[PDB]
């Protein structure tokens, strides 16, 4: 459960993942969600803080004095809703459901959202086939 | 950076800790903090979702229909502010600054906040001296 960290502190091995699991539980129950992300027809409820923690685009939007209080955010209508859904699930779980059928949409969405590690991972999996 | 999870998904090893680090960065800059916790004289700004993820007491408070929207929460005046500070830092970092001088205050605060793993850890470190 815990160990002696490199610093003075006792560090809890699974704490960050346990927190993320609880944040995903709140999302699943729509508890304290404070924004709706609109992608084409689709709507996705989330917590701004989680979106900011995972995405350079959301970090930029919600640190903007005018946009920080917005309850609705519309994404570029060219964004694939399934690609966005896969990335939102990844934000809340650390698991990326990458498949041959969705990798291009996921990569394009991750580029737009400025999710660097996901973009790089997509690029590596694409290179593996070529 | 990533591995093949037990499920179909690609899993990112450090994602949950990277998210928690970013949430702590937002806390340090007072960005999107939505509650102030008052302990005696002291005030602590935080994100309700993080508090709920880490504490049975905060989970109960912010899932209550009446209390969920409160911007200010007063804790029991008998709570030690340093003990609360150590636990709030732990929530956002996974690191618990447990010392001989603060262990009793930290344990009492963790019991009040319903932070089970911290309570159990305090109990184990206390037992080690006796
Ligand atoms: C001083 C400030 C600190 N910082 C930061 N702080 C807080 C957040 Cl929410 C945050 N989130 C954020 C910002 C940019 C991101 C970002 C999050 N992620 C996700 C990073 C991760 C490791 C979680 O995958 C990215 O890929 N990019 C490009 N970032 C990086 C910024 C540039 O500068
Ligand atoms: C169905 C629902 C799911 N659940 C839950 N969901 C969301 C959150 Cl924010 C949340 N957070 C929460 C609640 C209680 C906690 C709690 C968080 N922590 C922290 C747990 C942790 C592993 C992060 O240290 C505790 O020690 N206790 C007792 N809990 C447990 C509750 C009892 O039942």
From Swiss-Prot, chains A, B:
Substitution effect: residue 117 to A: Abolishes interaction with NCOR2 and HDAC2, no effect on interaction with CTBP1 and transcriptional autoinhibition
Maturation and modification: Phosphorylated by ATM in response to genotoxic stress. Phosphorylation induces its degradation by ubiquitin/proteasome pathway. Polyubiquitinated. Polyubiquitinated by SCF(FBXO11), leading to its degradation by the proteasome. Ubiquitinated by the SCF(FBXL17) complex, leading to its degradation by the proteasome: ubiquitination by the SCF(FBXL17) complex takes place when aberrant BTB domain dimers are formed.
Every BTB domain range: 33-100
Connected disease: Chromosomal aberrations involving BCL6 are a cause of B-cell non-Hodgkin lymphomas (B-cell NHL), including diffuse large B-cell lymphoma and follicular lymphoma. Approximately 40% of diffuse large B-cell lymphomas and 5 to 10% of follicular lymphomas are associated with chromosomal translocations that deregulate expression of BCL6 by juxtaposing heterologous promoters to the BCL6 coding domain. Translocation t(3;14)(q27;q32). Translocation t(3;22)(q27;q11) with immunoglobulin gene regions. Translocation t(3;7)(q27;p12) with IKZF1 gene 5'non-coding region.
Induction, as annotated: Down-regulated during maturation of dendritic cells by selective stimuli such as bacterial lipopolysaccharides (LPS), CD40LG and zymosan. Protein levels decreases upon genotoxic stress in a dose- and time-dependent way.
The protein's name: B-cell lymphoma 6 protein
Assembly with partners or alone: Homodimer. Interacts (via BTB domain) with the corepressors BCOR, NCOR1 and SMRT/NCOR2; the interactions are direct. Forms preferably ternary complexes with BCOR and SMRT/NCOR2 on target gene promoters but, on enhancer elements, interacts with SMRT/NCOR2 and HDAC3 to repress proximal gene expression. Interacts with histone deacetylases HDAC2, HDAC5 and HDAC9 (via the catalytic domain). Interacts with ZBTB7 and BCL6B. Interacts with SCF(FBXO11) complex; the interaction is independent of phosphorylation and promotes ubiquitination.
Free-text tissue specificity from the UniProt record: Expressed in germinal center T- and B-cells and in primary immature dendritic cells.
Function statement: Transcriptional repressor mainly required for germinal center (GC) formation and antibody affinity maturation which has different mechanisms of action specific to the lineage and biological functions. Forms complexes with different corepressors and histone deacetylases to repress the transcriptional expression of different subsets of target genes. Represses its target genes by binding directly to the DNA sequence 5'-TTCCTAGAA-3' (BCL6-binding site) or indirectly by repressing the transcriptional activity of transcription factors.
Domain comment quoted from the record: The BTB domain mediates homodimerization. Its dimer interface mediates peptide binding such as to corepressors BCOR and NCOR2. Interaction with corepressors through the BTB domain is needed to facilitate the rapid proliferation and survival of GC B-cells but is not involved in the T(FH) formation and BCL6-mediated suppression of T(H)2 and T(H)17 differentiationrequired for GC formation.
Localization per Swiss-Prot or TrEMBL: Nucleus
Natural source organism: Homo sapiens (Human)
Domain of life: Eukaryota
């Amino acid at each position: 459960l815990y160990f002696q960290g490199a610093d003075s502190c006792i560090q809890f091995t699974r704490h960050a993942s346990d927190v993320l699991l609880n944040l995903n539980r709140l999302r699943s129950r729509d508890i304290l969600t404070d924004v709706v992300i609109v992608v084409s027809r689709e709507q996705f409820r989330a917590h701004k803080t989680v979106l900011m923690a995972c995405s350079g685009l959301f970090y930029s939007i919600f640190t903007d004095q005018l946009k920080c209080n917005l309850s609705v955010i519309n994404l570029d209508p060219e964004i694939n809703p399934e690609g966005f859904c896969i990335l939102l699930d990844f934000m809340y779980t650390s698991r990326l459901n990458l498949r041959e059928g969705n990798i291009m949409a996921v990569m394009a969405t991750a580029m737009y959202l400025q999710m660097e590690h996901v973009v790089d991972t997509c690029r590596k999996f694409i290179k593996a086939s070529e």
